[PDB]
Design a protein around this ligand. Structure first.
Ligand SMILES: Nc1ncnc2c1ncn2[C@@H]1O[C@H](COP(=O)(O)OP(=O)(O)OP(=O)(O)O)[C@@H](O)[C@H]1O
Ligand SMILES: Nc1ncnc2c1ncn2[C@@H]1O[C@H](COP(=O)(O)OP(=O)(O)OP(=O)(O)O)[C@@H](O)[C@H]1O
Ligand SMILES: Nc1ncnc2c1ncn2[C@@H]1O[C@H](COP(=O)(O)OP(=O)(O)OP(=O)(O)O)[C@@H](O)[C@H]1O
Ligand SMILES: [Ca+2]
Ligand SMILES: [Ca+2]
Ligand SMILES: [Ca+2]
Lengths: 222, 361, 224, 361, 350
């Protein structure tokens, strides 16, 4: 329902009760789909740790990420011999250097497998991406939370072609209200949820030309 | 039960049934995924380029992402061919010097995921030789991702003589994309490379004498040809027609240090036994879509004669269907009764495991 | 002072004196500067003619226009080979290609062996210019009178005060403005007058009845 | 003496060969009346003064000429008005973008001999001139101006056509993006008179942060990066993180909605596809050029950012005069005594025509 | 002092007589439009298989050797050249012709490589297995003189092994197709390979644990791991079928050369088998040779494989020792002798 291109059209129809769930669903979607530099957070959250400690980190998303990296010894293990002149810091660089390079992993049972450099990064990111409980996501994203969640929000079907339909002045006005909603970082979800509730109830008429013209036409009659 | 035949390429995947003179299905080897359906395969992925991020599981002939590869086959079986793999023996293909791990994984997937009653993995260049009705001869297999020169002796390749050349159709497409900016056009995006590809496939040809074609294109506009883009626009190209495939014979055009396909064939022959060299010169087969350029065969002999002994008779073989000669060779092979004892049964796999591929194939 | 890029911001700060004078100047400017939609005119005056027939027509402004288009073969000639998607008159394609590739370079070879590259817009503009220099004054006036409603609106949108109006306020508001502008031409005799009134009333509000901010404020005021 | 004219997509520089700076810099624009009838055309500063009356058009877009009428006008204006000289008494060293379409090189030559009837003329790649200005003849050059950014490797003063790559991202796009992120802060710059102010804010307050994420966290948490700027009417604005966010689009084109990679990647990509024998000389000779490379602390981030995407085993040259280094290179070249033979004389053109440029340049 | 020039099929090794080390080692290749020519091969093998194939190239090599590497006047120093076993008479003549009619050497001598290697070990009798880059030789020797009828040449050496290692690394997933990537695989070979005493047992060990695996860091910072590739590579020396050759291993080639000698001297050859050349540097190669030759020889026969730690340059060292003797200065070929006797004199003085 979130990916309905006419969400703003039918959103005012539904009840106060269904709005409370639609606003939460839409809210959680923004935080989960929001993007963050994974190479930075995984590096900060496992610096100085050993590979054994990484496989049992307190953060489930850190385990998921690392578990997908450790499958491929060649990306992190230090060589016995070297060409003449943290562990994940080595891993992330080897996976970026060997972008097209193939790494071998051996399954629990004898089975082997070859993966490309980025296919391991992508697999590790996906593993992590499906582990955070949104709150931890909000904490690590606290700095770019309003920018990142907004980027997600714009890509929804209901927002496709909003600036061309309502003008750039209205679009940037929606952005301001989107950003302004975030008072504290401890209430970021509740904040943006309320913003989405208030606007979905109004069908975002407060940012559309049609809605504003209807409002002045509705206001003058008093 | 009829046997299936699947030729997996870097750029294109050809699938069909054994016995047929051609594949029933032909689609790009691409997987598009959104930004979290969860995946799209084939032309459908290209039509939805705007939504998806497209990637190639086979790169330079080798599988690089088995999650995507497993999906290509799932799409090949249930969507393209519309069959159940558990009631069809499957003949797959692979590049020369294919990593042993990929040999194993290709087998592991067929039996554990698709549960094929039996399967087999053949070298692509070897199948191309069968399609030409030979057991001895050298095969130039040039597709989208990689070019190989593979000498064969009585149905068996010669691993020591095989040379790999990372110069194929994609590189030529990109080269055409770049030289077209000399006429003032702009082809840079990943979507435009797909457009310029079709221009290359339809308007490019190999020049027998390169500089005599350059002088011709300079002294006249008789070689200039026009192409209508998907957006309704129209462009004309002149010497870019034959300058593009010339990169095969002169990789220096791409700033590449490698040798030409003519010399790479020669070098490959010059790594075999002195005795058999003759049969190779007389059985030089051209395979893959990147050998479809008109005038390429009539160019190759001129290029290798200058390298080969003048006494030896050279004969180049360019089958009119050499774009699918790999699949055709697979169709012939998988249909023979005398081959039915060479498949890899489910029993043999349950016993030995994925490593079975190394002794059977 | 019509060309003040921030006209709509400064006009509401003016007294009813210079407002009307400004509206008169603007109104007079729109009609004096009104031109013709060369696309439909040339497309119609050449509809059903070959490239050879387009240079033997009676009208001269068309022959001068076409002379600039036919220099560039890629903008009209049919391609030898076509992409698997080409479901596709002689000018109707020329104008479409020159618009499809407005920033793409077309090639022309002079009478002598020299070559030249030119973008679609420059070509399309060079043809229009050649037409304006080769057209008769009365011939222009007749075709103009057939639809001065859109011509005067074109001029208005081409003004600095209307640069990227739809871009800033949206197409939904742009068409609303155009609807009112056209609605003023309900009467032919008092057309020049009804539009001058339309301009003055909006110039007083600074077109706040069509802009996002203007509406946002208007709501905030009506809320009181 | 000779004349040296460096034509950019937004700025034209001109002067005499020998001087250490161009005597005339002005916008590469041509203005014409918005409407038919209420001079026929203006050029340079004058066209900008009469911005209200005129519709402005850029004859050089992304470094390439797209309208030769307007291009002639700029040159005519450059000679007879800006420099006050007779072009038929001075050889003319011009400059062109890398990968310049071949016809544009001919038309440029045609104009200089037929219209202005110059004694002689020469055309040099802009990046290659920037290289000469650094007292060198080997290395790689990053030339980022107003309309386009390029990355050209060079050997013995000869460019490497196959190795060159471009990027449609430069000073103009930054100005536009700066306007956007300033509205995100709470302002409204949109008019052309406001654009030139954001442009000045850009050329005076923007810089490149060595770590973007760290700078942003400081900007959100602290107020040490805020800086006040006096708007022309007297109003003050306290732009903050926008200082480094705007030039960040260079390294992250995704900020503008582009799939292409940044410049640090473009440079690495450009170098690798050259000859391995000189790559360490290119790394040891990475010159910055163009107005968009004038941001303070940008050369440090290039040095920083490549080391991540480079062999773990590189001096980046950012001369303080790299805003006009293309022109300065032309001044040196056009004044050298060992170059006077490299010119294209009248006779050389009268015999071979415009097509001669392809060999001499 | 006298100059000593060991012309290898992969590496030329120049120096001065008296020293215990060449002081100059460079690839024997000439590009057209030494080590400098190799590093710039992208924009630009005379002694392939041990024998000279192109003389113009050799002149450039010898020219390169004197003035650049050694930096000496060839008119002021006698020159000791080394020669491949079974070198045709024509090549021997032309080698002497060039040294006089081009470089004006005061005198020159042409010794056999295997003979010098043996002499370095303090022996005048024995059999030498010389394995280099391009070609391997088994040279039975009796009292200073090689025995041509018993010398066996094998076109299989270090170069073929580099290629083979480069090839089997692709089985593991890695990719070394580029020319620049070759010099890396060569280094890997020289650092991580070894000869297995029992091959089949070593394959069994490698397939049941990672105890034999070792890691190597590439120049770009990447790391590759190899297991059984470590010994399968040099194993081609004992099983040329791995390379797709019909030839027989170095162990059988050594034996065959012994059986091509008179029965009387064979016991000495068995008791004095000396290893020579960079390709005989692999750890565990001597023990293997000991094992394989014992398996071929008569039960009673006494076998001993000598593997000098300095056997990478035993040819040159031999030449240095021979050219430093006070009793050797009389056996040179002076200028006057060549001027009157011609190139053919070499057959009578060497
Ligand atoms: N008629 C044609 N003329 C020239 N080139 C062609 C033609 N048809 C196809 N090609 C080229 O051949 C390539 C695909 O051919 P093919 O299917 O033989 O290779 P592949 O198996 O997909 O890739 P590879 O086998 O190298 O991994 C494409 O790059 C395409 O441009
Ligand atoms: N100190 C500075 N800091 C930031 N930007 C600058 C500075 N100086 C100039 N610029 C930018 O550089 C651009 C003009 O530079 P330049 O003249 O090198 O480009 P050009 O050559 O005209 O364009 P092209 O890329 O086509 O060569 C302008 O967009 C301007 O905003
Ligand atoms: N420690 C080592 N381990 C394995 N191989 C080595 C070692 N050192 C050198 N090599 C190999 O030895 C070869 C070169 O050795 P050498 O110089 O003795 O032969 P050559 O002079 O080229 O030929 P020849 O001596 O037969 O004329 C190279 O292929 C190199 O890889
Ligand atoms: Ca194929
Ligand atoms: Ca410039
Ligand atoms: Ca030697």
């Amino acid at each position: 329902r979130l990916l309905s291109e006419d969400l703003f059209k039918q959103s005012p129809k539904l009840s106060e009760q269904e709005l409370d769930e639609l606003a939460n669903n839409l809210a959680d979607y923004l935080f989960q789909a929001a993007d963050i530099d994974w190479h930075q957070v995984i590096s900060e959250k496992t610096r100085g740790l050993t590979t054994e400690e990484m496989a049992k980190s307190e953060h489930r998303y850190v385990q998921a990420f690392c578990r997908e990296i450790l499958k491929y010894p060649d990306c992190y293990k230090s060589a016995d011999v070297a060409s003449p002149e943290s562990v994940i810091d080595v891993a992330l660089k080897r996976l970026q250097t060997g972008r097209e390079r193939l790494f071998t992993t051996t399954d629990e049972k004898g089975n082997r497998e070859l993966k490309k450099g980025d296919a391991i990064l992508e697999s590790a990111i996906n593993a992590a991406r499906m582990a955070i409980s949104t709150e931890e996501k909000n904490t690590i994203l606290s700095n770019n939370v309003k920018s990142a969640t907004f980027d997600v929000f714009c890509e929804l079907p209901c927002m496709d072609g909003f600036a061309e339909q309502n003008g750039k002045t209205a679009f940037y006005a929606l952005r301001a209200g989107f950003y302004s909603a975030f008072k504290n970082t401890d209430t970021a979800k509740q904040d943006i949820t309320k913003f989405m509730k208030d606007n979905l109830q109004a069908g975002f008429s407060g940012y559309s030309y049609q809605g504003l013209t209807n409002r002045v036409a509705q206001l003058e009659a008093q | 039960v009829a046997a299936l035949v699947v030729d997996n390429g870097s750029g294109m995947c050809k699938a069909g049934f054994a016995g047929d003179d051609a594949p029933r299905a032909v689609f790009p080897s691409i997987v598009g995924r959104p930004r979290h359906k969860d995946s799209y395969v084939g032309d459908e992925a290209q039509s939805k380029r705007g939504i998806l991020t497209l990637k190639y599981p086979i790169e330079h002939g080798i599988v690089t992402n088995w999650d995507d590869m497993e999906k290509i086959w799932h799409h090949t079986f249930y969507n393209e061919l519309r069959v159940a793999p558990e009631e069809h023996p499957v003949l797959l293909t692979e590049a020369p010097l294919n990593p042993k791990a990929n040999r194993e994984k290709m087998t592991q997937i067929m039996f554990e995921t698709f549960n094929t009653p039996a399967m087999y993995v053949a070298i692509q260049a070897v199948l191309s030789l069968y399609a030409s009705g030979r057991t001895t001869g050298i095969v130039l297999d040039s597709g989208d991702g990689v070019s190989h020169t593979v000498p064969i002796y009585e149905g068996y390749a010669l691993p020591h003589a095989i040379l790999r050349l990372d110069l194929a159709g994609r590189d030529l497409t990109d080269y055409l994309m770049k030289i077209l900016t000399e006429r003032g056009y702009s082809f840079t995006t990943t979507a435009e490379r797909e457009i310029v590809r079709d221009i290359k496939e339809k308007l490019c040809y190999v020049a027998l004498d390169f500089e005599q074609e350059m002088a011709t294109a300079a002294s006249s506009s008789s070689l200039e040809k026009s192409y209508e883009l998907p957006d309704g626009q129209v462009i004309t190209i002149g010497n870019e027609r034959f300058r593009c495939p010339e990169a095969l014979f002169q990789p220096s055009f791409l700033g590449m240090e490698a040798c030409g396909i003519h010399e790479t064939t020669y070098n490959s022959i010059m790594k075999c036994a002195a005795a058999i060299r003759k049969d190779l010169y007389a059985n030089t087969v051209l395979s893959g879509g990147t050998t479809m350029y008109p005038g390429i065969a009539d160019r190759m002999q001129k290029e290798i004669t200058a390298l080969a002994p003048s006494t030896m008779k050279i004969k180049i073989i360019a089958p009119p269907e050499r774009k699918y000669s790999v699949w055709i060779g697979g169709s012939i092979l998988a249909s023979l009764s005398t081959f039915q004892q060479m498949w890899i049964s489910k029993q043999e796999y349950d016993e030995s495991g994925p490593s079975i591929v190394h002794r059977k194939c």
